[PDB]
Amino acid sequence: VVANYENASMAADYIKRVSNVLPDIGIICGSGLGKLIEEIEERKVIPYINIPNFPKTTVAGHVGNLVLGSVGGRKIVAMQGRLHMYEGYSNQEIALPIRVMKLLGVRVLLITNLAGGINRKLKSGDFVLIKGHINFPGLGLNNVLVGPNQDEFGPRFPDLSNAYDRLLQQLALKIAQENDFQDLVHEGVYAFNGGPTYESPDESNMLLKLGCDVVGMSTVPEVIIACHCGIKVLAVSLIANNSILDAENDVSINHEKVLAVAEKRADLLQMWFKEIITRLP
Amino acid sequence: VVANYENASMAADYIKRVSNVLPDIGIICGSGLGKLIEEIEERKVIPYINIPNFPKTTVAGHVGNLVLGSVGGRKIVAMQGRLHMYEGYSNQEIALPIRVMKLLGVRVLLITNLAGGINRKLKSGDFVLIKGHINFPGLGLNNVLVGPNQDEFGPRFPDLSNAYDRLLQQLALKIAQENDFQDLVHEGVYAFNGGPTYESPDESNMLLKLGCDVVGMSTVPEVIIACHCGIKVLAVSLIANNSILDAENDVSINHEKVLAVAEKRADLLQMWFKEIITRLP
Amino acid sequence: VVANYENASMAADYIKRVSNVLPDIGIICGSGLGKLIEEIEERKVIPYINIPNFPKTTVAGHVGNLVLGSVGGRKIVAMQGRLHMYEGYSNQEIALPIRVMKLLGVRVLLITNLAGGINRKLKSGDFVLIKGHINFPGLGLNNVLVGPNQDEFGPRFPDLSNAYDRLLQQLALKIAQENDFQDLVHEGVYAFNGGPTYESPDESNMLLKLGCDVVGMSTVPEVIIACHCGIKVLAVSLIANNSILDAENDVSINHEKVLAVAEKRADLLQMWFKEIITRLP
Ligand SMILES: Cc1ccnc(O)c1
Ligand SMILES: Cc1ccnc(O)c1
Ligand SMILES: Cc1ccnc(O)c1
Numbered sequence: 001v002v003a004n005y006e007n008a009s010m011a012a013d014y015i016k017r018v019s020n021v022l023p024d025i026g027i028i029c030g031s032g033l034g035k036l037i038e039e040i041e042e043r044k045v046i047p048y049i050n051i052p053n054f055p056k057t058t059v060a061g062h063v064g065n066l067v068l069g070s071v072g073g074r075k076i077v078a079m080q081g082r083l084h085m086y087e088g089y090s091n092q093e094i095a096l097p098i099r100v101m102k103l104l105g106v107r108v109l110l111i112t113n114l115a116g117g118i119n120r121k122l123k124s125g126d127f128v129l130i131k132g133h134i135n136f137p138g139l140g141l142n143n144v145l146v147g148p149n150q151d152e153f154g155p156r157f158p159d160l161s162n163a164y165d166r167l168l169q170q171l172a173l174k175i176a177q178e179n180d181f182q183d184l185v186h187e188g189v190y191a192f193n194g195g196p197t198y199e200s201p202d203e204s205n206m207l208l209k210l211g212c213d214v215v216g217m218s219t220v221p222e223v224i225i226a227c228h229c230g231i232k233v234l235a236v237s238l239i240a241n242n243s244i245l246d247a248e249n250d251v252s253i254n255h256e257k258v259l260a261v262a263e264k265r266a267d268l269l270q271m272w273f274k275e276i277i278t279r280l281p
Numbered sequence: 282v283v284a285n286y287e288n289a290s291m292a293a294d295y296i297k298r299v300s301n302v303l304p305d306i307g308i309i310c311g312s313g314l315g316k317l318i319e320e321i322e323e324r325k326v327i328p329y330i331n332i333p334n335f336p337k338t339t340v341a342g343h344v345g346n347l348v349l350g351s352v353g354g355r356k357i358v359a360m361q362g363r364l365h366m367y368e369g370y371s372n373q374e375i376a377l378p379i380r381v382m383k384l385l386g387v388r389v390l391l392i393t394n395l396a397g398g399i400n401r402k403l404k405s406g407d408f409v410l411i412k413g414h415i416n417f418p419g420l421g422l423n424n425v426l427v428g429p430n431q432d433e434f435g436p437r438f439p440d441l442s443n444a445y446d447r448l449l450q451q452l453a454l455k456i457a458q459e460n461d462f463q464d465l466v467h468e469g470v471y472a473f474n475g476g477p478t479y480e481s482p483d484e485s486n487m488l489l490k491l492g493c494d495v496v497g498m499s500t501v502p503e504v505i506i507a508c509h510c511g512i513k514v515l516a517v518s519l520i521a522n523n524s525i526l527d528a529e530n531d532v533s534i535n536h537e538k539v540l541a542v543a544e545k546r547a548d549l550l551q552m553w554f555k556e557i558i559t560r561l562p
Numbered sequence: 563v564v565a566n567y568e569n570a571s572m573a574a575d576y577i578k579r580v581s582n583v584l585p586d587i588g589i590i591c592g593s594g595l596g597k598l599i600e601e602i603e604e605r606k607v608i609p610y611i612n613i614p615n616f617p618k619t620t621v622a623g624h625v626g627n628l629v630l631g632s633v634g635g636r637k638i639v640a641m642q643g644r645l646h647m648y649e650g651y652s653n654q655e656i657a658l659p660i661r662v663m664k665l666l667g668v669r670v671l672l673i674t675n676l677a678g679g680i681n682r683k684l685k686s687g688d689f690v691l692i693k694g695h696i697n698f699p700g701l702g703l704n705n706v707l708v709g710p711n712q713d714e715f716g717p718r719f720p721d722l723s724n725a726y727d728r729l730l731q732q733l734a735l736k737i738a739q740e741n742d743f744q745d746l747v748h749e750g751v752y753a754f755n756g757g758p759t760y761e762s763p764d765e766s767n768m769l770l771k772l773g774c775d776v777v778g779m780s781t782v783p784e785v786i787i788a789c790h791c792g793i794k795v796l797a798v799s800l801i802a803n804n805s806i807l808d809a810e811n812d813v814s815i816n817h818e819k820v821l822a823v824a825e826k827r828a829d830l831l832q833m834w835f836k837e838i839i840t841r842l843p
Pocket of ligand 3: 676
């Protein structure tokens with residue numbers, strides 16, 4: 001199923017019939033960082049498998065719902081269960097849920113992820129406001145837009161120089177200052193590793209030389225589809241470890257240690273993003 | 282349809298029946314840089330869709346013709362409507378038209394493209410004679426030769442160290458000197474970005490560190506198929522912008538600005554390549 | 563055919579019925595470096611094409627056998643005819659033979675390859691003990707583990723920091739010292755170029771800047787599948803040329819020169835790996 005105008009429209013039609021919510025904000029939450037979705041008010045939970053033309057996700061299993069409702073007086077739509085390209089999903093499967101968001105009325109997309117630190121000033125537990133990216137799949141002929149262009153959504157050759165909205169970064173930092181946790185908040189360049197193996201010690205050393213501050217396996221595909229169709233983006237990484245320090249000390253990373261960092265920062269990230277949603281212009 | 286000896290032969294048979302031209306020069310012209318094709322003498326226009334085993338191009342649409350005839354007393358074949366890998370074409374679809382050129386008798390392939398400047402001495406409107414490349418799709422398992430080797434055309438493991446003929450570069454520069462526009466002509470290393478998103482500001486900064494002079498989304502696949510089967514190559518980029526300066530000044534690139542640069546330099550590029558064809562040994 | 567638990571089990575069942583050997587060591591030998599397989603004792607040769615669920619290899623042709631028997635009193639299984647990703651094999655086709663090795667009882671995998679030298683201290687004829695890697699296909703969304711995870715074999719997100727066993731490197735070097743050829747033995751970081759074109763002169767210059775010591779077109783996929791399922795690895799490159807010196811002197815590489823280096827070092831590599839097998843803990 002192609003992520004075209006007709007197919008996205010049929011999914012949006014179903015959603016509008018069931019939910020009655022007209023959202024102008026979308027959210028995609030990272031691994032262990034989804035608590036906010038359980039606090040959406042007057043909410044409606046729609047399993048992906050019920051929505052016409054949504055991608056099949058049963059091989060990977062686990063949760064996959066679209067959730068609509070209100071936060072801070074604002075109308076939102078959330079993806080509960082993100083699609084990752086290391087699972088084997090195609091370009092068309094990644095793009096269709098974002099283009100449905102567009103047809104539903106979304107103008108701002110807020111994204112979180114868990115990532116590895118490269119810049120030496122980053123520690124486990126820090127947040128990074130993403131200000132640009134290095135898209136290794138894109139350079140290597142696996143960009144999320146490879147294929148026919150869907151002209152109704154956007155141009156054949158997008159410019160990404162303003163993909164990460166500057167005023168949204170400034171609002172996120174302002175709220176951290178108001179609540180006295182700005183000492184945790186950095187800005188940086190995100191490198192997209194297709195995955196699913198963690199960056200090796202020598203890949204980490206290479207990324208340091210190339211000007212990368214953070215590395216992870218998500219986010220850049222969704223940012224590109226959003227920018228292509230005119231949706232503004234804020235993207236924030238939670239740092240699980242510093243991979244350069246780990247290479248110097250021969251220390252390993254693993255999914256269990258990552259998720260313990262997520263649990264440590266989940267409630268603060270929930271409070272931060274609730275206020276960001278409330279304060280959006 | 283595989284780009285094998287049998288299938289390429291059937292396409293060449295059709296072409297020979299219709300055109301009567303036996304070319305020894307091939308040309309592939311970049312976006313907005315095709316005016317020379319409209320001035321081929323005693324010419325024959327063959328739509329791709331009529332040629333057995335040529336790739337289907339109707340999803341992308343727009344022009345797609347093979348044009349045979351004479352320029353400067355020399356017999357040539359031109360591709361009018363280039364195939365780009367960001368459209369989703371396979372390795373086999375890109376390679377078959379070049380291998381048909383080989384079977385028709387082509388010994389020299391002349392290529393132009395529109396590209397972004399990385400080296401600080403490059404301005405909008407400059408030309409770059411390409412002397413080597415950095416093939417990010419190739420390093421990343423998307424080389425145009427991934428698949429079975431077609432032994433009749435070339436070896437399993439090609440050497441690319443002489444892919445860009447030195448004497449052809451010298452002839453191009455000599456002609457620019459004769460017509461007093463050598464101040465526009467540089468040489469440089471071409472980085473292949475699969476695309477279709479323009480290089481981001483941080484990708485541009487990375488490419489500067491890695492020794493790239495120019496970046497674009499074409500040309501390297503055709504060069505590799507030509508080198509594999511023994512065809513000599515001249516490749517010239519027209520620079521639309523300097524992406525490093527643009528990142529420093531927060532200025533955007535877009536397809537409209539690119540095509541205005543193409544129109545500005547089209548007639549000079551036409552005159553240059555007409556003389557190159559006339560003067561080839 | 564997916565490289566899952568059921569399918570790997572059916573291949574292992576066939577092999578156990580035919581060979582009676584229960585190996586705990588596996589070997590994969592590089593191009594022109596397979597002489598040791600012809601000296602396996604009380605051996606059993608099983609063509610890939612006879613084994614249920616093994617990948618089809620007739621388009622590429624040439625030898626493809628699994629060979630079981632004894633070396634130095636140890637029980638081994640060898641792949642005679644390696645599968646390379648530049649031939650077009652899928653992730654699932656590369657992984658299934660390694661996962662069959664796991665089910666048969668393999669705990670240690672020994673690998674050799676032919677590679678190009680980047681570090682300036684490497685000469686034609688030198689050996690490199692691989693201590694880490696830079697996986698350009700992996701960064702670019704062509705990692706061998708892209709797809710559903712097969713949970714019975716290993717975790718969704720592997721850590722590769724100990725993929726190249728340190729004690730096995732130390733044993734290999736000790737044996738070289740005992741036989742007075744340690745002057746040929748280096749250690750280094752291996753860059754994976756998907757291929758099949760040799761690294762270009764400008765790609766070589768880039769790899770030097772990025773901390774790569776050696777470059778080649780194999781080995782990293784098998785290492786990752788082995789590490790994922792808990793198999794220890796020793797990987798050794800034989801250097802055919804120095805690509806940085808060749809770029810400075812405008813000298814070419816080709817398959818014929820490569821194989822002459824292989825013949826020059828084949829008998830020493832055979833003796834070295836026989837002793838390594840004998841001495842494994
Ligand atoms: C959380 C973690 C840290 C390391 N690298 C990633 O891709 C993810
Ligand atoms: C003409 C243009 C300039 C920027 N980058 C490209 O790929 C193309
Ligand atoms: C043997 C050789 C030397 C150059 N590069 C490779 O991939 C292989």
